[PDB]
């Protein structure tokens with residue numbers, strides 16, 4: 001077994017907490033204190049390999065090995081904010097090659113104001129993976145966290 005320190009970042013309301021709880025507790029939380037910033041740990045099998053994922057749900061971060069950059073597809077400002085978050089991540093780590101994944105959450109909803117090619121183009125500009133998620137239906141949620149872990153596995 002090996003442990004992995006993941007950090008979830010992004011504007012408030014995008015579903016950072018709902019994604020972590022859905023990953024950890026396999027259920028959708030429609031209301032979670034937006035002020036609560038905590039770490040949640042869980043042993044998982046990723047590609048036949050059992051991990052311990054330690055996940056800081058922001059609202060410690062220096063030592064994270066991988067970062068989920070989350071925006072909501074029904075909120076362009078949260079998308080416009082991604083750049084600020086990637087930049088601050090490179091700053092905290094004093095590096096430019098940090099394992100990182102772009103996550104478009106709430107893809108269960110109509111009224112999408114961020115197109116898929118929009119986010120894909122941004123992810124390509126950063127050179128990181130992009131996964132569209134739904135915390136409510138658990139779409140792609142596993143894929144998002146595992147891909148980050150694969151991104152970390154490549155970094156080592």
Ligand SMILES: Nc1nc2c(ncn2[C@@H]2O[C@H](COP(=O)(O)OP(=O)(O)O)[C@@H](O)[C@H]2O)c(=O)[nH]1
Pocket residue numbers: 010011012013014015016017018019029030031032033034105106107108109133134135136137
């Ligand atoms: N429909 C839908 N709602 C979501 C999803 N993820 C989060 N939400 C809602 O968005 C609001 C903010 O979620 P939360 O996890 O607290 O966002 P946070 O501020 O980043 O922690 C909550 O009311 C959630 O119910 C999703 O995938 N689909």
Ligand SMILES: [Mg+2]
Pocket residue numbers: 016017018032033034035036057058059
């Ligand atoms: Mg939260």
